[PDB]
Amino acid sequence: ITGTSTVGVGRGVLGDQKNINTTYSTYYYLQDNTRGNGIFTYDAKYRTTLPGSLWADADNQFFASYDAPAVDAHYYAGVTYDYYKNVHNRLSYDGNNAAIRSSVHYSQGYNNAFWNGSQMVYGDGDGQTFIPLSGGIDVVAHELTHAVTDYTAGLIYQNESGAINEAISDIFGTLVEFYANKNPDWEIGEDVYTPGISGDSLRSMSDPAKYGDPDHYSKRYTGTQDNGGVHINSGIINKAAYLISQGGTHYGVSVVGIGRDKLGKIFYRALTQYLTPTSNFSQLRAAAVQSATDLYGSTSQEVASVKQAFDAVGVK
Ligand SMILES: [Ca+2]
Ligand SMILES: [Ca+2]
Ligand SMILES: [Ca+2]
Ligand SMILES: [Ca+2]
Ligand SMILES: [Zn+2]
Numbered sequence: 001i002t003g004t005s006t007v008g009v010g011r012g013v014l015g016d017q018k019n020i021n022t023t024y025s026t027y028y029y030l031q032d033n034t035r036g037n038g039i040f041t042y043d044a045k046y047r048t049t050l051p052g053s054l055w056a057d058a059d060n061q062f063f064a065s066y067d068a069p070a071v072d073a074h075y076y077a078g079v080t081y082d083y084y085k086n087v088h089n090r091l092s093y094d095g096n097n098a099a100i101r102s103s104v105h106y107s108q109g110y111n112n113a114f115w116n117g118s119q120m121v122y123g124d125g126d127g128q129t130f131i132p133l134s135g136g137i138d139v140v141a142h143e144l145t146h147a148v149t150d151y152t153a154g155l156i157y158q159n160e161s162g163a164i165n166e167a168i169s170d171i172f173g174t175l176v177e178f179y180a181n182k183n184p185d186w187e188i189g190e191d192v193y194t195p196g197i198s199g200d201s202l203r204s205m206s207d208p209a210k211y212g213d214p215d216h217y218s219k220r221y222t223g224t225q226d227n228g229g230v231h232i233n234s235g236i237i238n239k240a241a242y243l244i245s246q247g248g249t250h251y252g253v254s255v256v257g258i259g260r261d262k263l264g265k266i267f268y269r270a271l272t273q274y275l276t277p278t279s280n281f282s283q284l285r286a287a288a289v290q291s292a293t294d295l296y297g298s299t300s301q302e303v304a305s306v307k308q309a310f311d312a313v314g315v316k
Helices: 065-088 137-151 159-180 225-229 234-246 260-274 281-296 301-312
Strands: 004-011 017-025 027-029 039-043 100-106 113-115 120-123 248-250 253-255
Touching: 004 065, 017 065, 039 065, 065 100, 065 120, 065 137, 065 159, 065 260, 113 137, 120 137, 137 159, 159 225, 159 234, 159 260, 159 281, 234 248, 234 260, 234 281, 234 301, 253 301, 260 281, 260 301, 281 301
Parallel strands: 039 100, 100 120
Antiparallel strands: 004 017, 017 027, 113 120, 248 253
16 A cells, blocks of 8 residues: 555564554554565455455554564565565566565464465464464475575475475574574574473474484475375485584584574575576586586585585485
Protein backbone atom coordinates (compact mmCIF):
# COMPACT_ATOMS: atom_id res chain seq x y z
CA ILE A 1 0.00 0.00 0.00
CA THR A 2 1.04 3.66 -0.34
CA GLY A 3 1.76 5.48 2.90
CA THR A 4 4.26 6.82 5.36
CA SER A 5 7.16 4.71 6.63
CA THR A 6 7.33 4.33 10.36
CA VAL A 7 8.51 2.04 13.13
CA GLY A 8 6.40 -0.01 15.47
CA VAL A 9 7.18 -2.34 18.32
CA GLY A 10 6.08 -5.77 19.34
CA ARG A 11 6.93 -9.11 20.83
CA GLY A 12 8.04 -12.22 18.97
CA VAL A 13 7.18 -15.89 19.47
CA LEU A 14 9.79 -16.36 22.21
CA GLY A 15 8.50 -13.28 24.06
CA ASP A 16 11.39 -10.94 23.11
CA GLN A 17 10.61 -7.32 22.23
CA LYS A 18 11.72 -5.81 18.91
CA ASN A 19 11.22 -2.85 16.60
CA ILE A 20 9.73 -3.46 13.17
CA ASN A 21 9.39 -1.34 10.06
CA THR A 22 5.73 -0.65 9.25
CA THR A 23 3.76 1.57 6.86
CA TYR A 24 1.02 3.95 7.91
CA SER A 25 -2.10 4.61 5.90
CA THR A 26 -5.22 4.71 8.13
CA TYR A 27 -3.93 1.44 9.56
CA TYR A 28 -0.35 0.46 10.26
CA TYR A 29 0.68 -2.35 7.91
CA LEU A 30 3.47 -4.87 8.10
CA GLN A 31 5.21 -3.41 5.09
CA ASP A 32 8.88 -2.51 5.37
CA ASN A 33 9.86 0.02 2.69
CA THR A 34 13.48 0.31 3.79
CA ARG A 35 14.64 -2.90 2.07
CA GLY A 36 14.52 -3.31 -1.71
CA ASN A 37 11.00 -3.20 -3.11
CA GLY A 38 9.65 -4.12 0.32
CA ILE A 39 9.02 -6.83 2.85
CA PHE A 40 5.33 -7.64 3.20
CA THR A 41 3.79 -9.88 5.86
CA TYR A 42 0.31 -11.33 5.48
CA ASP A 43 -2.30 -12.99 7.67
CA ALA A 44 -3.61 -16.30 6.24
CA LYS A 45 -6.21 -16.47 9.08
CA TYR A 46 -5.88 -20.22 9.62
CA ARG A 47 -6.81 -20.91 5.97
CA THR A 48 -4.74 -22.38 3.17
CA THR A 49 -5.63 -19.62 0.73
CA LEU A 50 -2.58 -17.47 -0.09
CA PRO A 51 -1.33 -14.87 0.48
CA GLY A 52 -4.21 -13.73 2.70
CA SER A 53 -4.54 -10.10 3.94
CA LEU A 54 -1.67 -7.69 4.27
CA TRP A 55 -1.25 -7.49 8.06
CA ALA A 56 -3.09 -4.38 9.35
CA ASP A 57 -2.90 -3.08 12.90
CA ALA A 58 -4.68 -0.09 14.48
CA ASP A 59 -1.98 1.33 16.83
CA ASN A 60 1.45 0.13 15.60
CA GLN A 61 1.94 -1.97 18.76
CA PHE A 62 2.18 -5.75 18.24
CA PHE A 63 1.94 -7.36 21.69
CA ALA A 64 -1.07 -9.68 21.15
CA SER A 65 -0.21 -13.36 21.11
CA TYR A 66 -1.90 -13.57 17.66
CA ASP A 67 0.69 -10.92 16.52
CA ALA A 68 3.83 -12.82 17.56
CA PRO A 69 4.44 -15.00 14.45
CA ALA A 70 3.91 -12.01 12.17
CA VAL A 71 6.39 -9.89 14.13
CA ASP A 72 9.08 -12.54 13.76
CA ALA A 73 8.38 -13.42 10.12
CA HIS A 74 8.58 -9.73 9.25
CA TYR A 75 11.66 -8.97 11.33
CA TYR A 76 13.71 -12.08 10.46
CA ALA A 77 12.98 -11.60 6.74
CA GLY A 78 14.60 -8.14 7.18
CA VAL A 79 17.63 -9.65 8.92
CA THR A 80 18.03 -12.27 6.21
CA TYR A 81 17.80 -9.55 3.53
CA ASP A 82 20.53 -7.59 5.35
CA TYR A 83 22.74 -10.68 5.46
CA TYR A 84 22.57 -11.26 1.72
CA LYS A 85 23.13 -7.57 0.97
CA ASN A 86 25.93 -6.82 3.45
CA VAL A 87 27.81 -10.09 3.19
CA HIS A 88 27.31 -11.20 -0.42
CA ASN A 89 26.26 -8.01 -2.21
CA ARG A 90 23.04 -9.70 -3.31
CA LEU A 91 19.86 -7.62 -3.48
CA SER A 92 16.94 -9.76 -2.32
CA TYR A 93 16.50 -13.32 -3.54
CA ASP A 94 16.47 -12.58 -7.29
CA GLY A 95 19.42 -10.17 -7.16
CA ASN A 96 17.28 -7.22 -8.33
CA ASN A 97 15.47 -6.42 -5.06
CA ALA A 98 12.27 -8.50 -5.46
CA ALA A 99 9.64 -7.93 -2.75
CA ILE A 100 9.70 -10.52 0.00
CA ARG A 101 6.29 -11.79 1.07
CA SER A 102 5.43 -14.10 3.98
CA SER A 103 2.14 -15.42 5.26
CA VAL A 104 1.67 -16.61 8.83
CA HIS A 105 -1.15 -18.46 10.58
CA TYR A 106 -1.24 -20.80 7.61
CA SER A 107 -3.84 -23.55 8.16
CA GLN A 108 -4.51 -25.12 11.62
CA GLY A 109 -1.87 -27.02 13.59
CA TYR A 110 0.51 -26.95 10.61
CA ASN A 111 3.97 -28.17 11.59
CA ASN A 112 6.02 -26.84 8.70
CA ALA A 113 7.15 -23.78 6.78
CA PHE A 114 8.04 -23.43 3.13
CA TRP A 115 8.88 -21.32 0.12
CA ASN A 116 6.17 -22.05 -2.44
CA GLY A 117 7.89 -20.57 -5.52
CA SER A 118 6.55 -17.03 -4.90
CA GLN A 119 6.51 -16.54 -1.14
CA MET A 120 7.24 -17.95 2.28
CA VAL A 121 4.53 -19.62 4.34
CA TYR A 122 4.58 -20.45 8.11
CA GLY A 123 2.39 -22.75 10.11
CA ASP A 124 1.67 -22.13 13.80
CA GLY A 125 2.65 -25.67 14.80
CA ASP A 126 0.44 -27.88 16.95
CA GLY A 127 1.93 -26.54 20.14
CA GLN A 128 3.81 -29.71 21.11
CA THR A 129 5.92 -30.72 18.12
CA PHE A 130 6.41 -27.06 17.08
CA ILE A 131 5.48 -23.58 18.13
CA PRO A 132 5.00 -21.00 15.35
CA LEU A 133 7.79 -21.64 12.90
CA SER A 134 8.72 -18.03 12.15
CA GLY A 135 10.08 -17.91 15.75
CA GLY A 136 13.34 -19.42 14.50
CA ILE A 137 15.73 -17.26 12.54
CA ASP A 138 17.47 -20.35 11.09
CA VAL A 139 14.01 -21.47 9.85
CA VAL A 140 13.18 -18.12 8.19
CA ALA A 141 16.63 -17.95 6.55
CA HIS A 142 16.45 -21.61 5.50
CA GLU A 143 13.17 -20.93 3.61
CA LEU A 144 14.29 -17.63 2.08
CA THR A 145 17.47 -19.33 0.90
CA HIS A 146 15.29 -21.74 -1.13
CA ALA A 147 14.26 -18.63 -3.09
CA VAL A 148 17.92 -17.71 -3.65
CA THR A 149 18.68 -21.23 -4.85
CA ASP A 150 15.66 -21.25 -7.18
CA TYR A 151 16.87 -18.03 -8.94
CA THR A 152 20.46 -19.21 -9.25
CA ALA A 153 21.47 -22.89 -9.50
CA GLY A 154 17.83 -24.08 -9.74
CA LEU A 155 18.61 -27.36 -7.98
CA ILE A 156 15.74 -29.76 -8.59
CA TYR A 157 13.92 -30.96 -5.45
CA GLN A 158 14.74 -34.64 -6.01
CA ASN A 159 17.48 -37.12 -5.02
CA GLU A 160 21.03 -35.71 -4.70
CA SER A 161 20.33 -32.37 -6.29
CA GLY A 162 17.45 -31.92 -3.84
CA ALA A 163 19.65 -32.87 -0.85
CA ILE A 164 22.09 -30.17 -1.94
CA ASN A 165 19.21 -27.74 -2.21
CA GLU A 166 18.22 -28.56 1.44
CA ALA A 167 21.79 -28.46 2.76
CA ILE A 168 22.39 -24.99 1.21
CA SER A 169 19.29 -23.77 3.03
CA ASP A 170 20.51 -25.34 6.33
CA ILE A 171 24.00 -23.88 5.80
CA PHE A 172 22.86 -20.34 5.05
CA GLY A 173 20.11 -20.52 7.67
CA THR A 174 22.86 -21.23 10.17
CA LEU A 175 25.18 -18.49 8.86
CA VAL A 176 22.34 -16.05 9.16
CA GLU A 177 21.76 -17.21 12.75
CA PHE A 178 25.44 -16.46 13.47
CA TYR A 179 25.19 -13.12 11.69
CA ALA A 180 22.34 -12.05 13.94
CA ASN A 181 24.15 -13.52 16.96
CA LYS A 182 20.89 -15.15 17.94
CA ASN A 183 22.35 -17.66 20.44
CA PRO A 184 23.99 -19.24 17.40
CA ASP A 185 24.66 -22.98 17.02
CA TRP A 186 25.01 -25.65 14.31
CA GLU A 187 21.54 -27.08 14.95
CA ILE A 188 18.37 -26.45 12.91
CA GLY A 189 15.05 -25.33 14.41
CA GLU A 190 15.99 -25.64 18.10
CA ASP A 191 14.11 -22.45 19.04
CA VAL A 192 10.71 -23.68 17.77
CA TYR A 193 10.99 -27.48 17.95
CA THR A 194 9.34 -29.40 20.85
CA PRO A 195 8.72 -26.69 23.43
CA GLY A 196 8.38 -29.49 26.00
CA ILE A 197 11.97 -30.77 25.60
CA SER A 198 15.16 -28.75 25.97
CA GLY A 199 18.43 -29.33 24.13
CA ASP A 200 17.02 -30.92 20.96
CA SER A 201 16.50 -29.76 17.36
CA LEU A 202 15.10 -30.99 14.07
CA ARG A 203 18.51 -31.62 12.49
CA SER A 204 22.10 -31.21 13.55
CA MET A 205 24.90 -30.09 11.22
CA SER A 206 27.69 -30.87 13.71
CA ASP A 207 26.44 -34.43 14.23
CA PRO A 208 23.59 -35.36 11.83
CA ALA A 209 23.59 -38.94 13.16
CA LYS A 210 22.32 -37.68 16.50
CA TYR A 211 18.81 -37.74 14.87
CA GLY A 212 19.42 -40.65 12.51
CA ASP A 213 20.64 -38.69 9.46
CA PRO A 214 23.67 -39.91 7.48
CA ASP A 215 27.07 -38.33 8.05
CA HIS A 216 28.88 -40.33 5.41
CA TYR A 217 28.09 -41.04 1.74
CA SER A 218 28.14 -44.80 2.42
CA LYS A 219 25.10 -44.28 4.65
CA ARG A 220 22.96 -42.37 2.18
CA TYR A 221 19.29 -43.11 1.86
CA THR A 222 18.51 -44.65 -1.53
CA GLY A 223 14.73 -45.20 -1.41
CA THR A 224 11.77 -43.06 -2.45
CA GLN A 225 10.50 -41.33 0.72
CA ASP A 226 10.97 -37.58 1.17
CA ASN A 227 11.57 -37.14 -2.58
CA GLY A 228 14.50 -39.54 -2.48
CA GLY A 229 15.71 -38.34 0.96
CA VAL A 230 16.22 -34.59 0.41
CA HIS A 231 15.92 -33.84 4.12
CA ILE A 232 17.89 -37.02 5.04
CA ASN A 233 20.89 -37.04 2.72
CA SER A 234 21.45 -33.37 3.35
CA GLY A 235 23.19 -34.49 6.56
CA ILE A 236 26.20 -35.61 4.48
CA ILE A 237 26.66 -32.11 3.03
CA ASN A 238 25.80 -30.37 6.32
CA LYS A 239 28.53 -32.40 8.04
CA ALA A 240 30.99 -31.48 5.27
CA ALA A 241 30.12 -27.78 5.69
CA TYR A 242 30.49 -28.03 9.47
CA LEU A 243 33.96 -29.59 9.03
CA ILE A 244 35.10 -26.92 6.56
CA SER A 245 34.14 -24.22 9.01
CA GLN A 246 35.06 -25.71 12.41
CA GLY A 247 37.53 -28.49 11.63
CA GLY A 248 37.57 -31.92 13.24
CA THR A 249 38.44 -35.53 12.62
CA HIS A 250 35.59 -37.56 11.11
CA TYR A 251 35.93 -41.26 10.28
CA GLY A 252 39.68 -40.93 10.72
CA VAL A 253 40.04 -38.01 8.29
CA SER A 254 41.32 -34.74 9.77
CA VAL A 255 40.10 -31.34 8.61
CA VAL A 256 41.59 -27.97 9.52
CA GLY A 257 38.75 -25.48 9.91
CA ILE A 258 38.80 -22.18 7.98
CA GLY A 259 35.84 -20.54 9.75
CA ARG A 260 32.33 -19.35 8.91
CA ASP A 261 33.08 -16.36 6.74
CA LYS A 262 35.11 -18.32 4.21
CA LEU A 263 32.58 -21.20 4.31
CA GLY A 264 29.85 -18.76 3.27
CA LYS A 265 32.00 -17.20 0.54
CA ILE A 266 32.91 -20.56 -0.96
CA PHE A 267 29.39 -21.97 -0.92
CA TYR A 268 27.78 -18.76 -2.18
CA ARG A 269 30.16 -18.78 -5.14
CA ALA A 270 29.59 -22.50 -5.83
CA LEU A 271 25.84 -21.84 -5.72
CA THR A 272 25.71 -18.80 -7.96
CA GLN A 273 28.50 -19.61 -10.41
CA TYR A 274 28.97 -23.39 -10.79
CA LEU A 275 25.95 -25.45 -9.67
CA THR A 276 23.16 -26.36 -12.05
CA PRO A 277 19.68 -27.88 -11.66
CA THR A 278 20.91 -31.52 -11.80
CA SER A 279 24.18 -31.21 -9.87
CA ASN A 280 24.95 -34.28 -7.72
CA PHE A 281 27.23 -34.53 -4.63
CA SER A 282 30.32 -35.23 -6.72
CA GLN A 283 29.62 -32.13 -8.78
CA LEU A 284 29.13 -30.13 -5.57
CA ARG A 285 32.63 -31.15 -4.49
CA ALA A 286 34.12 -29.96 -7.83
CA ALA A 287 32.12 -26.73 -7.62
CA ALA A 288 33.32 -26.08 -4.05
CA VAL A 289 36.98 -26.87 -4.87
CA GLN A 290 36.82 -24.61 -7.91
CA SER A 291 35.21 -21.81 -5.85
CA ALA A 292 37.85 -21.90 -3.11
CA THR A 293 40.45 -22.04 -5.95
CA ASP A 294 39.03 -18.88 -7.53
CA LEU A 295 39.02 -17.10 -4.21
CA TYR A 296 42.19 -18.25 -2.41
CA GLY A 297 44.49 -19.99 -4.92
CA SER A 298 44.95 -23.65 -5.83
CA THR A 299 47.65 -24.24 -3.18
CA SER A 300 45.81 -22.48 -0.36
CA GLN A 301 44.84 -24.04 2.98
CA GLU A 302 41.22 -23.23 1.98
CA VAL A 303 41.23 -25.53 -1.04
CA ALA A 304 42.98 -28.22 1.04
CA SER A 305 40.31 -28.07 3.77
CA VAL A 306 37.44 -28.28 1.25
CA LYS A 307 39.05 -31.43 -0.20
CA GLN A 308 39.60 -33.06 3.22
CA ALA A 309 36.04 -32.24 4.34
CA PHE A 310 34.50 -33.98 1.34
CA ASP A 311 36.96 -36.93 1.67
CA ALA A 312 35.83 -37.22 5.31
CA VAL A 313 32.15 -37.67 4.32
CA GLY A 314 33.07 -40.03 1.50
CA VAL A 315 32.18 -37.72 -1.42
CA LYS A 316 34.58 -38.13 -4.35
CA1 LIG B 1 -1.89 -3.43 17.90
CA1 LIG C 1 20.17 -21.10 18.17
CA1 LIG D 1 20.07 -23.04 14.98
CA1 LIG E 1 12.75 -28.64 22.02
ZN1 LIG F 1 14.05 -26.73 2.98
